[PDB]
Design a protein around this nucleic acid. Structure first.
Length: 58
DNA sequence: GGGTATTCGCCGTGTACCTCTCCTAGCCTATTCTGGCTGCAAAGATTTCGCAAAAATCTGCGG
């Protein structure tokens, strides 16, 4: 819930290139949950960086 | 009470041709390993097609 803004901001870049924005943010939320399930801080990286690639893939 | 007094949606809109093809956009965008699926190549198994060919069969006519 706290990271939905990242999904919205990322998806609005892809909205100008066709496809509904709402579907994009829903898929990005799916990818965000996938990243959350796989996130760790033992790596030392920022969560936003890790979630960015997941959201882009979704 | 009470009677308008606004605003808030919903709906209706002639017929019938013809020519046109015009319909179509960003590009900002990561790597890959394992396993199956499907079209194709190859092999066993099998039926279906034609000539072969001789033997039986069908048909025309004059002595």
């Amino acid at each position: 819930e706290a990271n939905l803004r990242l999904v919205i901001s990322i998806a609005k870049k892809y909205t100008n290139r066709g496809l509904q924005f709402l579907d994009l943010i829903q898929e990005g939320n799916i990818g965000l949950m996938k990243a959350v399930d796989k996130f760790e801080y033992r790596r030392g990286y920022k969560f936003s960086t890790y979630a960015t690639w997941w959201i882009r893939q979704a």
